[PDB]
Structure 1
């Protein structure tokens, strides 16, 4: 996993690679790490995939209810606080590493959170196996007063660094752009630079090729009338 978040003039952008792995094996070549806590608050996750997904959904739920009870757009500081107190209570055993980014009435925000419950503020952040590769590019090319166009470029370049140089990261670049006074725009498969080439051969076999012992029909339907 390689995730980054990059603040810019009028908002915050978040990016991630699209590879999920069981040990050295790739399970999902086009996985989606970019999750939605509320409509204008997105985060991305590394570590135990289940743990990060559970914790996003639990805090997304409680934030939705809070937003209804208060009659206000939800705030990032709230998602941040809820996450860190939950992760701290569980003492690191909930292996959730998250970059959380949103726009709210207070403005644009960018936070990181580590499994033990520590939190981090900044203008650019990285996380995951690919984090050092991403942070190299961010430290080399980040400036104050980035435009939306420059921040997306800088975010994707930082994910690309992870894709190529980190074995734990690969496939495509997913982006979400949260700009103040605008709807969040989620660019699933923004960059598509790892398409498998045409195979030399079709392995479609001739029917009859497999040896069968017994056929039968299975009733999926409920018990019928008459």
Structure 2
């Protein structure tokens, strides 16, 4: 997995590749690693996929209830604190490595969080197996006062480094943009640089090819009237 987060002028952007692997095998070619915690707080997850999904939804649920209770729009530091205290308690066994970002009444924020519950702050971050490929690009092209367009470009360039150079990452680039005073725009499959080429042959079979012993209509209906 490759995930990044980049701050810009008036907000924050996160991106991620779309490959999930079982050892050397690609289980899903178009995985969604960008998670919504609240409308304007999204986080990218690397590590154990079930853990990143589960911990993201639990905290998301509790954040929603908190927002309703306080009559306030949720803040990123709350999602951060809730995530880290949960993860720390499980001493790393919940394998969720997250880049947490969003906008709230306080401003725009970017954090990352390791599975053991240690957190950090920055203008640009990366996590996952492709984090070194990504970080090399971030350390090469990042500057102060990025515009929205510059940050999207930098973020997806860093995901591409991971896609091309890391065997743990591949397929497509997802992006989410969180700008102050605007709706978050989740850009699913922002890039598509890995369409499979056309096959040499069609493997559609002549009907009747397969040997059959028995057929039966399976009854999916409930018990019938009359």
- When normalised by structure 2's length, the TM-score is 1.00
Deviations 1:123-155 (A, max 9, x none): 000000000000000000000000000000000
How much does 1:115 deviate?
A: 0.6
Q: Matched residues in 1 for 2:100 and 2:178: separation?
A: 12
How much does 1:5 deviate?
A: 0.2
How much does 1:202 deviate?
A: 0.4
Q: Matched residues in 2 for 1:149 and 1:58: separation?
A: 32
Deviations 1:157-176 (A, max 9, x none): 00000000000000000000
Q: Matched residues in 1 for 2:46 and 2:30: separation?
A: 15
How much does 1:54 deviate?
A: 0.5
Across the two proteins, how many residue pairs are aligned to each other? 226
How much does 1:27 deviate?
A: 0.7
2:116 aligns to what SS in structure 1?
Answer: coil
What runs of 5+ residues in structure 2 fail to find an aligned partner? none
Moved over 2 A (4+): none
How much does 1:200 deviate?
A: 0.3
Q: Matched residues in 2 for 1:151 and 1:92: separation?
A: 31
Deviations 1:44-63 (A, max 9, x none): 11111101110000000000
Q: Matched residues in 1 for 2:115 and 2:29: separation?
A: 25
Q: Matched residues in 2 for 1:192 and 1:92: separation?
A: 34
Give the structure 2 partner of residue 143 of structure 1: 143
How much does 1:67 deviate?
A: 0.2
C-alpha RMSD of the superposition: 0.4
What runs of 5+ residues in structure 1 fail to find an aligned partner? none
Deviations 1:20-59 (A, max 9, x none): 1111000111111000000000001111110111000000
